[PDB]
Every structure is written in C-alpha cells, then in structure tokens.
Amino acid sequence: KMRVIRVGTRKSQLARIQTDSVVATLKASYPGLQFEIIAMSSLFTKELEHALEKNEVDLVVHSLKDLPTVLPPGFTIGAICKRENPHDAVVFHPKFVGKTLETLPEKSVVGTSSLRRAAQLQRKFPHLEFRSIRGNLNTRLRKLDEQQEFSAIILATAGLQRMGWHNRVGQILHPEECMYAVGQGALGVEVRAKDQDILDLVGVLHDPETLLRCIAERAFLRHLEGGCSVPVAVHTAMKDGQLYLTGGVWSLDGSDSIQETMQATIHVPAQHEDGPEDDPQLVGITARNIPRGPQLAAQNLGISLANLLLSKGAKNILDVARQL
Ligand SMILES: *Cc1[nH]c(Cc2[nH]cc(CCC(=O)O)c2CC(=O)O)c(CCC(=O)O)c1CC(=O)O
C-alpha cells in the first residue's frame, strides 16, 4: 500500500524546468517521499486541469501570471513559491548588443505580443515600433537573430534566467519604463481544492513575502475585471513592515494612463499555523498555514487601489481597449 506524489507537466522546456525546480524543493523537505513526473501532451491549462479532476495527477506547476484570478471550482493554488526576478527584460539583436531601448535607432521594431508591454513601451518610447511576435522563448530568440525584422524583443527576466539565457538579458526594464504583469516571476502550484493531504505537503512551499505581494497584485487585478488579457500592470515591494503596491492601466497605444501607488503596514509573518479548513481561498490561493491577517490586509490593499483607479476612469480605459 504505497503512495506516490504524481506531478503533471507540459513537456515544453521552460514548463519542465519550472516543474523540476518545485519538485527539487519538495524532495529536500520530504526526502522520505516518492514523486512521479507525468508528461502529458492557452488550452494547456485546461488539460492539466482535466488530469487533476480525473485524478490522474496530484499537482501541477504554473507561472503564476498564467493563472486567472478566479480558478474553476474544485481547484486552488496551494503554494506560491519564492519569487524570482519579476522584471521585464529586453533582448537585443546581436547587432545591437550593449545598447538600450533609449539608444536604439529611431523606428526600430521591438517584438512583443503582450498588450501590457506594448502600451507601456509605446508611451515611453514614441520613436520605436512594437509589433506582435509569436512562439516560445527559443523560437522568439531565433526569429530575432535570423530574420531581420526585429531589432529587439521583450521577455520576462525570470524565463530567460530559468532557461539558461541569462547572458542575453540586455536590459532589465525599470517600473518607470515597463511595470510587470500580476504575479510575474512567481510559480504557483495548482492542486485539487479538497485534497487536504496534497495541500498539507505543498504548503511548505509558500514564501510569505511573495504570497502577500501576489495576493495584493491579484486582488487589484480581479477587482478591475482583469486577467492575462488586459493592459494592466503592477509593482510590489515589502520593506520595513510596509507593503507597497503600484498599479496602472493603459489604452492599447499607451496615450491614456492612470497610475497610482498605495501602501500599508503588513509585516512578513515568520510563523506557520494550522488554520481552519473552512477559511475560503483568497484570490484563488489556499494558505491556511500562513497567518491570515496579513493575507486579508494584502487583499484589501489590492482592492483599495483598484477602487482608486476606477474612480479616475479605469473601467473606461479597460472597456475601450477590450473592444479592440
Ligand atoms: C500573462 C502572460 N503570459 C505570457 C507568456 C508567459 N507566461 C510565463 C512566462 C515566463 C515568465 C514567468 O513565469 O513569469 C511567459 C513568457 C514571458 O513573459 O516572457 C505573456 C507574454 C505574451 C507575449 O508578450 O508574447 C503574458 C502577457 C504579459 O506578460 O503581459
């Protein structure tokens, strides 16, 4: 009568690397336990979810920014892992290595299929062109270097780092240039919402500071009626007992913009707990072993900033962008 922890992965390289980093952390906490990785084949979220409900697998690893602020019923995010670098990065064509976006020749084409990235970068760099680029990270790096269309592309720093492409990171974008997506750089572990055994085990992965930052960022996004699909961006930081949250929305061209910052006293809790089970998820995340007070406070900060943005016309900016 054995028990093996079954871990679902997409077989794509980056998804597989993320899965292994999490399994490695679990093995270190649970050396006496057995894990089995089950390769399978954004439809991919659906099918890995399908295997979870069909009980073919026990946990799957996502980039947090790829999960929506409300998960389908019967699933939850049981762990938010310690955040890697959240910043967007510029990769340059070999001809332009050493340059910045500030020093590219006028009318260079920058590749990105993110509405958030294009809107912010258009606003700050009027003399540049931004055009859609499709594919995974290696395919985008290929189309940048071999085809002569693009002079640069935008990618998450975290993804390049995980892929072993740290050296192609040419410039790391600051918040004044491009704020990042909600939950960028953090990994989220999705599990069956009722599965207390697996929820127990993966709970060891929660990093308190990352969990609180991502609750505030996801609550901001959810209250604005947003997902991966909208031109919304954020910056969070925890220092000296303060949780800072900057949030922004943009027209698809970046000409219209509301951006404000708010803060609150949330101390990063050092202790673990065994909170009650009937405590519901917060923005899709189950963290019963972290003190709940700081979580609720982070959720309120997100909501407060969304309300401030909405009172300055955010819903109009977002509804106008969506219809295009
Ligand atoms: C919301 C969104 N997801 C992606 C594709 C994606 N998802 C995860 C990563 C790696 C970074 C991480 O784990 O946080 C990536 C790739 C990347 O952002 O570099 C995108 C990118 C669409 C595109 O520009 O082609 C987005 C949109 C967004 O970030 O706003």
Residue numbers in the entry: 17 to 57, 75 to 357
Question: Any passages from the paper?
Answer:
Porphobilinogen deaminase (PBGD; EC 2.5.1.61), also known as hydroxymethylbilane synthase (HMBS), is the third enzyme in the heme biosynthetic pathway. The holoenzyme (Eholo) carries a dipyrromethane (DPM) cofactor, which is covalently linked to a conserved cysteine residue (Cys261 in hPBGD) through a thioether bond (Song et al., 2009).
Electron density is missing for the first 18 residues at the N-terminus and for the active-site loop residues Ser57–Lys74. Unfortunately, surface exposed residues in flexible sidechains, including Arg167, are not described in the electron density maps. Furthermore, both our structures contain two monomers in the asymmetric unit without indication of dimerization as also supported by the mass spectrometry results showing that except for minor dimeric forms, Eholo and the other enzyme-intermediates are monomeric. The crystallization of the wt-PBGD was performed from a mixture of intermediates, and the heterogeneity of the sample, as well as the flexible parts of the enzyme, such as the N-terminus and the loop including residues 57–74, most likely affect the quality of the data.
